[PDB]
């Protein structure tokens, strides 16, 4: 069940994430910005090990030759101390739960991974990640908030985010595939990309906040290159909500707790 | 004022986490800490990407010496002094060696040659020239001593762009590469097929100690067309390598070794 892997949070890759987001590259020993840890702990497989969608070949939990579309659906993180640039870190991972649910387009499989990240023998971060497999497929409207950021995705941004995460999933860069093969209108803006943007905006609007908890859940896919915004609002001291959306409604919602 | 001769230095760590991603892209073994970085994998490193706001429309950094022309990796030459070590620090000293613009009947052609010298632990490890061409949008496969058959796909191309953190849209943005730059499909990277061509030479001659490699693109290789790499020995310590398919050669190169 449990698997422990290791990585260096090396500055060369941190530079590439920072450039992707248009942000500064922290120096050795400084805090890895929130959710940039997704660029690390990658153990990619050779092509023979890959599935048609570019991800690692679908394993035992799925039926043979599963045609369903895989999606990064949401997750939850608990923040204890920042991981630090230039240091090593271990990730202890486990499949927490697998579950069949009944979706709008048919039955969808829900996989929840749990990861614990340690540095210098201390737990820095705990995460749950929800992965969904669903069949080829009226959200809440964009509410008013205390901050907002307008964004305009393009394929270079999406390609770069896939690059720093070394995610082979073809829905983020292979336009003929994402349309003809899995039936989307165009490229999908990564769930974790917009989560990072929404959390980043909260932090900008709240620079003294010290993150304790972040939850995010996708509602509908965002398609490149349609403009969108990230927003949020304080609900109470140390409590905020965030969202990602546009004129067609919200694509992602999330919850922040902080000190 | 003179564009050539301005030296710039950059530093990196040849960290194994990115070596694993290169190894996976190529389906090769992942060298252990402290072993040799395989030939031409140095291209995954020394990346100083620019922020999204300083990117040109083709996904490369914006042109400072301006504009609408296609940029292409034309060729290069390398001299191998000693292998770079996985896990070590390394430095690259770079300069513009030569610049030429010709205003001919097919538009203006801008040719640029960069020089890179790579040092590790106070020793020169590798020297490189890289030829870049800017140009307005647009032989048979010989018999040899060795050959390898290859089928490109967009994941491969995406992965090679990822490890080189190369934003150029011709390697992954199918609507751009066709409509905007006039190719028939995704372009298989020159450096990628150069790595494949040299790697197949090293496979067929595992005792060969590389001294020099030269490569030149001849025509774009388009994904997903099957292609093959090969080459043959010309003389003691001399080989030629090539990349091509039924449609003709896409790249040639020369290997000197001992």
From TrEMBL, chain A:
It comes from the Bacteria. Residues 49-122 form the FAS1-like dehydratase domain. Pfam families: FAS1_DH_region. Gene3D superfamilies: Hotdog Thioesterase. GO terms for molecular function: (3R)-hydroxyacyl-[acyl-carrier-protein] dehydratase activity. This is FAS1-like dehydratase domain-containing protein.
Automatic annotation (TrEMBL), chain B:
Residues 54-123 form the FAS1-like dehydratase domain. GO terms for molecular function: (3R)-hydroxyacyl-[acyl-carrier-protein] dehydratase activity. Pfam families: FAS1_DH_region. SUPFAM superfamilies: Thioesterase/thiol ester dehydrase-isomerase. InterPro entries: FAS1-like_DH_region, HotDog_dom_sf, Mitochondrial_HTD2. This is FAS1-like dehydratase domain-containing protein. It comes from Pseudomonas aeruginosa (strain UCBPP-PA14).
